Symmetry: C3
Subunit: 235 residues, 3 copies
């Protein structure tokens, strides 16, 4: 469920769920994790771009088919582990990582995007974190967003549950760039070439230092979040 | 010193100190805490709005003369503890909380407001944190504001001691909305109805998770602000 | 390598490296630390302004040819310890501190500036954190910047390695004011007089509380950054 192509030293991973909105099914997680592993392990690769695809959403979050079909505690507990593992998978890529966002980045897709070093979105795209509106728990989201963007910003976002257009994302500093849908991928690749040109020894050790507290946060959130979602999933 | 009213599932707590600027006296603390307890314990309540009242300040905070008048240290311990307990009282409300700010939100009033889930202010209102200007210590304000809005933002506010009108609060992201004084209360209630419509269990457990570090911070600050006036 | 003047209760420390870009050589660090010590220890001083000088940079930081030289594990460590000690030196000044920025504030100069209570820059000045562009490690810069201004802001800055002019710094909230180069020093001194007029008890204890987490973070970053500038 992911294409892997190359713009020279740049590896481009394109999400390809049967569904245009690239929902994170368990199969898609797997592919995305595996592609990231290969990219990180491959010396020909010096930078990575993850992309929803032309006329496709970055990801509309997890698979509503998994989520709505969750009752057992065993089942929910392990689902949270999966989710974090995915986010960690991105954070542990020792090379530069760009997220090219078009369409919708919702809930899990929003969060997934926040794991990247940089984010460019289309002028026509949207971010959303509408969990509580819908009756889903959002401790993991709160945790991430609080860490990346501050307490009061996070509060606003998760409690308002609004559809964030580009102007709004810029205002929140959720993205580094806004371009036309047609221009988006090339723009992302360029950013990747730029960061790829920074000496590797320097960039890897710095990125590691930078992402350590983030990883550590996510690990701490693991247990407590299993608690809210176990309790929430009974309606 | 409050009015408790209802817009259906929304409880509206209106501060009513004899003084139009709703200063936090001991008595007002008490009422506000008790009204919050009831609202949180009441089934019929699904969201809470706290409001200074029409043609009234949200709250000018606590008397700096009386703060400066405390010279026994348990006087200060008692007082520090009271202040935090108030802020914790808000943070422990398991339902949505909106603060409708008109007039002045000063010192304690500024801080008290930061405990809420959301904040709307009037176009004509002002936030201020002037403690250092008036020769008051300011650990608790800094601690809170650093946590809610970042180090460098807090630095600027505390050290500059300026009256922050609405444009400035928006720029700082201190509020979620600015409206006319006449429109403010209805606006706040609407927000409350919106958040009240969120499936409770999912909301409550999330809010608990969210506010936990905040509460823990207030506890750390309690100990520290009293290690100060002890040495 | 520093000239110490007085505007009444305000002490003004002007960086004076032979090089007009005030690079942080070991000698300059020393002078700056010693001038800060004296200013903090001097009762006649109630506030401090640090300035690059007219027609001179605040500081272009350390020399990236020398940094890339350091291969011996001691050399790396002692250098890191020095760098932090400098930043701590500013944080431990118990009186108000203003940084008057003209020219370039690069890497160490950017970071050094973030230690101050307030920052004014010239309209014509620039901030830069270009370490990764030039193959220099940046754990320290990121640690600081993440703490002062948030994770995602720090990310953007260190990964983009751009020259931030004034409009951009305002947009990032890196400074409290932008003025003409000619006006800059007087502006800084005024800010210093303003903060100097706040009661010393009130200020000193608050500032201590405020800067504690910052110091504690610098101390962690020290122990850590060794292992990465090592590898
Ligand atoms: C839950 N809702 C959501 O995740 C989002 O709000 C969206 C993206 C589904 C809303 O987008 P819309 O403008 O409503 O387009 P629409 O709902 O008609 O298309 C979505 C399609 O992808 C599927 N889909 C969208 N998001 C998800 C998701 N997160 N998980 C699983 N499937 C999804 C929808 O079921 C629908 O599939 P279909 O062709 O089998 O019916």
């Amino acid at each position: 469920m992911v294409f892997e192509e190359n713009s020279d030293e740049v590896r481009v991973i394109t999400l390809d769920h049967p569904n245009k909105h690239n929902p994170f099914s368990r199969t898609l997680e797997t592919s995305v994790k595996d592609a990231l592993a290969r990219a990180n392990a491959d010396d020909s690769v010096r930078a990575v771009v993850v992309y929803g695809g032309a006329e496709r959403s970055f990801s509309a979050g997890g698979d509503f088919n998994e989520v709505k079909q969750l009752s057992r505690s065993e089942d929910i507990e392990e689902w949270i582990d999966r989710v974090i593992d995915l986010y960690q998978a991105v954070l542990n890529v020792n090379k530069p990582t760009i997220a090219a966002v078009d369409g919708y980045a919702i809930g899990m897709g929003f969060q997934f995007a926040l794991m990247f070093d940089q984010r460019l979105m289309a002028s026509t795209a949207n971010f959303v974190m509408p969990e509580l509106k819908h009756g889903i728990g959002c401790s993991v989201g709160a945790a991430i967003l609080g860490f990346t963007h501050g307490f009061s910003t996070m509060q606003e976002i998760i409690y308002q549950c609004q559809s964030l257009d580009a102007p709004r994302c810029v205002d929140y500093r959720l993205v580094n760039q806004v371009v036309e849908s047609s221009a988006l991928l090339d723009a992302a690749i360029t950013q990747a070439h730029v960061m790829a040109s920074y000496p590797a020894s320097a960039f890897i050790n710095t990125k590691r230092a930078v992402n350590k507290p983030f990883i550590h946060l996510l690990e701490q959130t693991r247990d407590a979040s299993k608690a809210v979602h176990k309790a929430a999933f009974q309606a």
